[PDB]
Amino acid sequence: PVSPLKHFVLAKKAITAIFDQLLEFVTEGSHFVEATYKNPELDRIATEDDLVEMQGYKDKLSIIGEVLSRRHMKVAFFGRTSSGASSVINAMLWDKVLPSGITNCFLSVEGTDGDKAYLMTEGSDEKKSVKTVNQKAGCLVRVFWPKAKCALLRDDLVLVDSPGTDVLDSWIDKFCLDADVFVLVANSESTLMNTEKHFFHKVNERLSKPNIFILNNRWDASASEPEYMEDVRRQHMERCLHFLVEELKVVNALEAQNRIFFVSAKEVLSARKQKALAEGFHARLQEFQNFEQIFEECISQSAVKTKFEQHTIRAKQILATVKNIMDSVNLAAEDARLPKEIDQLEKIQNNSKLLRNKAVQLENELENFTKQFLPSS
Ligand SMILES: Nc1nc2c(ncn2[C@@H]2O[C@H](COP(=O)(O)OP(=O)(O)OP(=O)(O)O)[C@@H](O)[C@H]2O)c(=O)[nH]1
Incomplete structure (x- = not known):
């Protein structure tokens, strides 16, 4: 009685929503990594390779959301x-x-x-x-x-x-x-x-x-x-x-x-x-x-x-690499220095943990998306 087509329209709006959040998140995370790498009073807490990775992901996700739109x-x-x-x-x-x-x-x-x-x-x-x-x-x-x-x-x-x-x-x-x-x-x-x-x-x-x-x-x-x-x-x-x-x-x-x-x-x-x-x-x-x-x-x-599936897969991999990058920043920042520098490193620590937690939220939502729309997960 409900047209089975609705299944496709519902998946579409759900996957475009997720990739909206996704792009926003990786954009924010790229800024963070960029800030940390370019900060001149830190010692490789985040690297140029960390930065290039995120910029690549930001550009990649941008146009996935654009083709999802036209599907x-x-x-x-x-x-x-x-x-x-x-x-x-x-x-x-x-x-x-x-x-x-x-x-x-x-x-x-x-x-x-x-x-x-x-x-x-x-x-x-x-x-x-x-x-x-x-x-x-x-x-x-x-x-x-x-x-x-x-x-x-x-x-x-x-x-x-x-x-x-x-x-x-x-x-x-x-x-x-x-x-x-x-x-x-x-x-x-x-x-x-x-x-x-x-x-x-x-x-x-x-x-x-x-x-x-x-x-x-x-x-x-x-x-x-x-x-x-x-x-x-x-x-x-x-x-x-x-x-x-x-x-x-x-x-x-x-x-x-x-x-x-x-x-x-x-x-x-x-x-x-x-x-x-x-x-x-x-x-x-x-x-x-x-x-x-x-x-x-x-x-x-x-x-x-x-x-929709492969783009879902691709997103999962991307969120994995951003989690590894956040972890890498958090850990490098954990390693004598003044109490002024100490609280800068601590600020970076919890910004990375915050960023990392949203990645996990977005993985939830993506998992969540494969259960509702992609058996047998
Ligand atoms: N008997 C019968 N004829 C059919 C059926 N479906 C299509 N046709 C006929 O097959 C011919 C060619 O099919 P279509 O490609 O649909 O032709 P059309 O461009 O729609 O031409 P018209 O239907 O006559 O306006 C047409 O004359 C139709 O009347 C059917 O289920 N039963």
Whole structure:
């Protein structure tokens, strides 16, 4: 009932918060180390190498927080014209966000904070019209739709439509590695082609266990028929299971059950846009809904790990080195001198212990962050 996407948005705000505190802390600590090293009436209590380390960390953390900021979930769709990739996307959103072709470029869909749809094309910041004015290697058109109308877009998801995998070459995927999920939209009136497989083979080789879903769309055209339906499904199931589990070897048999879905995107869209019956419209709609719920669980989870974990790790290492540096200052300062110099060294002692204690606080919070958002810690 709570969109599983919220898991990603919550992790995002938590990890950006932590890295805010993180940058503040290492900035303060750099000043301290810098003060101590440049103080001319001390003898190497803090060193130039201590200083350079901290300055490096300050600069490193600055732009991690900047890329965390821009991180989002991405799902990419592929299919022959016309298994209905665009109708699948339009139905996940609840409107005809993508009319109606078609043109050789990737089509992504993002949310705007505004109220009006519009377009943008490579190397221009002009917001071109709603889509009306819609139509030398790869071409991307970014479509923007109001967040207030689609929960998916509000919750940090980008959907990408490829041009028909039917119609030319394959150095495409540098639009496509950002993607946390790839979805093959199949034509259930036909059979899984090798041209369809060929693309996901070249995705499998450059990505370790990518998440792949197969939508056998157009599942209307096999309606009306109770016995016929189960027999054709079993046959599509075999080719889909075989492809994922054995050809792509990207998922085991029992997992693959929750990667393959029989669906009617036309129906779902029509039913969803009508909010201001064929044979088995309800069962299919439920099925599209189960897909959404599993998809959202899968993308949110995967996206947190691949986009947030390593930065979390990096932060832990950084906090370790700053603790070692504080300790080193505290200890060096512990080692005859006047009672004027003695209380200067004591001031430095407890400033280092304070700095060191916050580092430990921030390690707590980071640990805390991996428990809530990164099993199995
Ligand atoms: N019968 C059936 N047709 C579908 C379904 N999904 C998409 N289509 C049709 O497949 C054709 C090509 O799919 P799309 O890529 O979605 O085409 P489109 O650009 O949206 O064109 P229109 O939907 O006609 O406006 C269209 O004519 C759709 O009507 C479906 O679930 N069932």
